[PDB]
Coordinates of C-alpha atoms (C1' of nucleotides) in Angstrom, one line a residue:
Chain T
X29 CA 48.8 13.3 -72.5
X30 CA 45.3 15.1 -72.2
X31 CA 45.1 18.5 -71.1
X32 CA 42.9 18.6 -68.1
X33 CA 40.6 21.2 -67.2
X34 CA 38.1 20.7 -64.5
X35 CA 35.8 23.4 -63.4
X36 CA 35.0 24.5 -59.6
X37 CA 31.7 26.6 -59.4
X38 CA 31.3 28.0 -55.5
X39 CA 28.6 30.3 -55.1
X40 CA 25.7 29.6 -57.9
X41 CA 28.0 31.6 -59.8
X42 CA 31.3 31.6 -58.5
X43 CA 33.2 29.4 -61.0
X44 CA 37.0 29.1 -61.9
X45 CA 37.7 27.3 -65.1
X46 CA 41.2 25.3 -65.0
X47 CA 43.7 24.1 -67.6
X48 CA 45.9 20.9 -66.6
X49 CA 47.9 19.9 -69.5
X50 CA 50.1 23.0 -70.6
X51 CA 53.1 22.3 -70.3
X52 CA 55.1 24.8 -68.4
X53 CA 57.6 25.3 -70.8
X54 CA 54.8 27.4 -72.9
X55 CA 54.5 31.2 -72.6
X56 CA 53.2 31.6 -68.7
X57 CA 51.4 34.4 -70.8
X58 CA 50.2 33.3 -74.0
X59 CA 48.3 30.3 -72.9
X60 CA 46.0 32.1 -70.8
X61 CA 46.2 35.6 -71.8
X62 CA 44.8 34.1 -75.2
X63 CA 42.2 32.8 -73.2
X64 CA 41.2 35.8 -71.1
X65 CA 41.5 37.8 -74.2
X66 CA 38.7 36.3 -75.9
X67 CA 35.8 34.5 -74.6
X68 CA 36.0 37.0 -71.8
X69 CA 36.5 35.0 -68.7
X70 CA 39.3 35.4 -65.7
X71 CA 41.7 32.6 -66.5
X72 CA 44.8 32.1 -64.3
X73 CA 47.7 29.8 -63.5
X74 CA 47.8 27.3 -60.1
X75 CA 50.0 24.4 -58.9
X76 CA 46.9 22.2 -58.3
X77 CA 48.4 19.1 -57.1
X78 CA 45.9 16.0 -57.5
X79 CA 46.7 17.0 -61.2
X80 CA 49.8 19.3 -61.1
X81 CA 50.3 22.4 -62.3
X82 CA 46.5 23.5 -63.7
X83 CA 44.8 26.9 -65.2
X84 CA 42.1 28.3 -63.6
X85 CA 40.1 30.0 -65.8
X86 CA 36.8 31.9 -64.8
X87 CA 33.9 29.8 -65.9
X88 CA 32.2 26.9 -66.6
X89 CA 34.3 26.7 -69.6
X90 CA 33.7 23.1 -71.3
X91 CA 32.0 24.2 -74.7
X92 CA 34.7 26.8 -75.0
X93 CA 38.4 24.9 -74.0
X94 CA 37.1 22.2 -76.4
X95 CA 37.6 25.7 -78.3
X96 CA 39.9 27.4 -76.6
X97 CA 41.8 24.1 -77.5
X98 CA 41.0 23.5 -81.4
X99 CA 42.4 27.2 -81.7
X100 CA 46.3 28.4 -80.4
X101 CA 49.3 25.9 -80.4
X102 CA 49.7 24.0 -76.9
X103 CA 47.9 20.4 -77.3
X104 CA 46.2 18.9 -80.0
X105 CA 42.2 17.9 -81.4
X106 CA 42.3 14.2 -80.1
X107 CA 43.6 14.8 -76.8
X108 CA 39.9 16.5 -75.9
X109 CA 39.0 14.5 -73.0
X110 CA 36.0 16.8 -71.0
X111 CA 34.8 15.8 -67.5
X112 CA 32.9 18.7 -66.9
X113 CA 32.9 19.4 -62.7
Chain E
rG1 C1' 12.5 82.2 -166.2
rA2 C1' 13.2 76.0 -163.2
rA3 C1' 16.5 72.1 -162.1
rG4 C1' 21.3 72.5 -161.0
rA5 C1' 25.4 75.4 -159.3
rC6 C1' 30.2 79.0 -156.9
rG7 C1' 31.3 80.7 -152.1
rG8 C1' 29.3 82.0 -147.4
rU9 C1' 26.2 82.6 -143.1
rC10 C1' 22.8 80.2 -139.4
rG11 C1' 23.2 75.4 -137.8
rA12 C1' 19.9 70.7 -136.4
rA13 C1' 22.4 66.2 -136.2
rC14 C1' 26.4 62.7 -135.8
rU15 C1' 31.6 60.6 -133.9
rU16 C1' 35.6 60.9 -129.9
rG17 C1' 37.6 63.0 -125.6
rA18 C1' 37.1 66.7 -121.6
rC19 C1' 33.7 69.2 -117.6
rU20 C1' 30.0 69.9 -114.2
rA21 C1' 25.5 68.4 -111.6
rU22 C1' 22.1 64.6 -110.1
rC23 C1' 20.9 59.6 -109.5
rU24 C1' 21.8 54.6 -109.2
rA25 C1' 24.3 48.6 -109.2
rG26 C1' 28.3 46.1 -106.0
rA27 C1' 31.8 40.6 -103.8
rG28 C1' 33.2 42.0 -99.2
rG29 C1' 34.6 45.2 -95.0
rA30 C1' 33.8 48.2 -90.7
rA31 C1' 30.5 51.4 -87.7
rG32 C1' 26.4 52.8 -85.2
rU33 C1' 21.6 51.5 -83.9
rA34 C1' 17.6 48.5 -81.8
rA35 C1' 18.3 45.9 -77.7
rA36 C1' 16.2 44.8 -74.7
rA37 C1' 15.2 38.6 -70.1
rG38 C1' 22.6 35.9 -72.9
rU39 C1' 28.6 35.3 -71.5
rC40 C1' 33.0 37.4 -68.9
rG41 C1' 35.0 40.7 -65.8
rU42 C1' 33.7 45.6 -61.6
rA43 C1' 35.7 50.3 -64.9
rA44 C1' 32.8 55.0 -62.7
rC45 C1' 23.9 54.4 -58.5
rA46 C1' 24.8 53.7 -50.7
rA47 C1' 31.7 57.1 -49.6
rG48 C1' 29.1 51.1 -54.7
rG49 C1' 33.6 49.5 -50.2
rU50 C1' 39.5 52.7 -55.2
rU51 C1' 34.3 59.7 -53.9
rU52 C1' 32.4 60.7 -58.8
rC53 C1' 32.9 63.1 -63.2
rC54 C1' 35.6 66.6 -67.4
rG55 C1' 39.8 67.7 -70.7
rU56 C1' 43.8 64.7 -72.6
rA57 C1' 47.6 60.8 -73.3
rG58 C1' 49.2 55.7 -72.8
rG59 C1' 47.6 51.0 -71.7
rU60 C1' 44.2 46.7 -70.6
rG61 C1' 39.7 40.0 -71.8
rA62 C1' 35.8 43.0 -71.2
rA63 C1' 33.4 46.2 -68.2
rC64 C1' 37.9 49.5 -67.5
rC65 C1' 42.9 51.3 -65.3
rU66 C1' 46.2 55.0 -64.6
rG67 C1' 49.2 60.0 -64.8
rC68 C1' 48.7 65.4 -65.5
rG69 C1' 45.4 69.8 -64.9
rG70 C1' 39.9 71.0 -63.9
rA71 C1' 34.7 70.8 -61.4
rA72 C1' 31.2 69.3 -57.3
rG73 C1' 26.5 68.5 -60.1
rG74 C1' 30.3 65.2 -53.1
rA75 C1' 31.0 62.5 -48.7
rU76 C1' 32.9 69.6 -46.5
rC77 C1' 28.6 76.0 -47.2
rA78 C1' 31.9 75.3 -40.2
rU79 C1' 37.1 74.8 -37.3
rU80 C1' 36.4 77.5 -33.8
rA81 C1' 44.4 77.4 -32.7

RNA sequence: GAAGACGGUCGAACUUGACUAUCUAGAGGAAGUAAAAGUCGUAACAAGGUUUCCGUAGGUGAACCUGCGGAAGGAUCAUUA
């Protein structure tokens, strides 16, 4: 079960870095304000539905939720599966 | 009238601690600095779209946010009842 994450840059700029594979039953808080909290980008928490339930993160984060995802407790290192948009 | 010699005084030096001053090694740790063309936010240059900033306290990815009392170096030197 691979934790998505798609990005979605707008502007040249405007980016929003998901996460779809969190389980909902994991802190609504710690997931992503571990994520906010440290590689400095706005993360956030959507019902995307193509995927279902998915967090947006600020960024074109696909070096760092490989990272963000060897590091606190929600997945695990062979699940990585990175389709950067 | 010599060596020697009784006991003393000065006391170098030596051994062990204490004291004070000056200098200097160090795994690692945490500041500040440069600085600067990087990353994430928009905190407070045009009222910067939440006027800004000071003292101070708590809190936040990060710029910062907020209360309480100040200041204009503000966006009012005026208010015509």
């Amino acid at each position: 079960d691979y934790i998505h994450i798609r990005i979605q840059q707008r502007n040249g700029r405007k980016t929003l870095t998901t996460v779809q594979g969190i389980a909902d039953d994991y802190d609504k808080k710690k997931l992503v304000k571990a994520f906010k909290k440290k590689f400095a980008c706005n993360g956030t928490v959507i019902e995307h539905p193509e995927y279902g339930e998915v967090i947006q993160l600020q960024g074109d984060q696909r070096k760092n939720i490989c990272q963000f995802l060897v590091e606190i407790g929600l997945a695990k290192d062979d699940q990585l599966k990175v389709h950067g948009f």
